[PDB]
């Protein structure tokens, strides 16, 4: 049953969508193309509808644009972006060339912003366990993938998605645990957790927690912290060269966190200390911390979802782009609006 779209110069090129939508505007950059904001005149919200830039142009971008529709589909949780929306301009396959993914136009995110912080990191964490709940990884959780509306209810937006942009002094390596950064091993879903505490940390402080200069410099500003590695974890780095460069560190203590983090509450300490652990395999992860006694306030475990199973076997299957772009064009195709 096909609305009537009508066409709009905008983000440099022009944009084609249904009528419902009204009153577009650039917001800027998002992940994998530009972003509108839009009155959405059916459902009376205020939406960010994303225009994919080229997203059949290769076997890589086929493929992305797949992973991103089928994560977006699969999300339906409070504090984790998800999708009202999805169209394409095409009546068929052949003319298929555009996607527009649709969700919630957000207010603010966590770097354009106690109890303040207790009820930010437990719907991060709420968000998070419905996430991980589903096998999947957020990769890349920073204070500008997490955004927030006017009462401070949170969703968090880029999940299951470049040497240069993580190159220096800059905050889109700030945040990310030292065995994703380093690539010391094959990774889990604590690498979030990492990134939390990270999080967590500099909303109490109003500071970055680790902000290194460069990759090293970064991890040591961070072994200083939680101390260097021990044996055991040592054994665990599979790249023989990270293992050896990590040997010829001076071995450091942890430090103390209530001498880092003066004058905050004691259970924010201590959660931070069992997030912010070197070793991944026992990081805190996001069922345990929403039990810890910081979020007393806000804890219900009878109101924290968890996902639906997330079919995640198209990741080691290799097909051509017109197999990815049929694949696509389905799920666009079989979409179903939330209530
Ligand atoms: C962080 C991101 O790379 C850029 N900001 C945003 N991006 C997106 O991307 C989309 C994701 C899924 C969709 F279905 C549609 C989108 F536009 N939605 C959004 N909805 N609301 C925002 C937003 C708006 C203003 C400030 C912060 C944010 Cl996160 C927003």
């Known amino acids: 049953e096909r609305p009537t779209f009508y066409r709009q110069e905008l983000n440099k090129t022009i944009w084609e969508v249904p009528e419902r939508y009204q009153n577009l505007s650039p917001v800027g950059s998002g992940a994998y193309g530009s972003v509108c904001a839009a009155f959405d005149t059916k459902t009376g919200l205020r939406v960010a509808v994303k225009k994919l830039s080229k997203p059949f142009q290769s076997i890589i971008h086929a493929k992305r644009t797949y992973r991103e529709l089928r994560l977006l589909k699969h999300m339906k949780h409070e504090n984790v972006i998800g999708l009202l929306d999805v169209f394409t301009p095409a009546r068929s396959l052949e003319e298929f060339n555009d996607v527009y993914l649709v969700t919630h136009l957000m207010g603010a995110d966590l770097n354009n912003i106690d109890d303040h912080v207790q009820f930010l990191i437990y719907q991060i964490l709420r968000g998070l366990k419905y996430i991980h709940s589903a096998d999947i990884i957020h990769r890349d959780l920073k204070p500008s993938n997490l955004a927030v509306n006017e009462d401070c209810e949170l969703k968090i937006l880029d999940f299951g998605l470049t040497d240069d942009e993580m190159t220096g002094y800059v905050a889109t390596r700030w945040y990310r645990a030292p065995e994703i950064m380093l690539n010391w091993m094959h990774y889990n879903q604590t690498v979030d957790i990492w990134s939390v505490g990270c999080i967590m940390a500099e909303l109490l402080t109003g500071r970055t927690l680790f902000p290194g200069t460069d990759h090293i410099d970064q991890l040591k500003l961070i072994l ?14 599979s790249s023989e060269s990270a293992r050896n460069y990590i040997q010829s560190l001076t071995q450091m ?39 810890h006694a910081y979020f007393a306030q806000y804890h219900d475990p009878d109101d924290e979802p968890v996902a639906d199973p997330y079919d995640q076997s198209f990741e080691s299957r290799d097909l051509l782009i017109d197999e990815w772009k049929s694949l696509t064009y389905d799920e666009v195709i079989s979409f179903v609006p939330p209530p």
């Not at 101390?227 to 040592?234: D, Q, S």
């Not at 069992?274 to 992860?285: A, E, F, N, Y």
């Open 224 to 237: 200083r912290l939680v101390g260097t590695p021990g044996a055991e974890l040592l054994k665990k780095i």
């Open 253 to 291: 203590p942890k430090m103390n966190f209530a001498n880092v983090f003066i004058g905050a509450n004691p259970l924010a300490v201590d959660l931070l200390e069992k997030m912010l652990v070197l070793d991944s395999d026992k990081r805190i992860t996001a069922a345990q911390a929403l039990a």
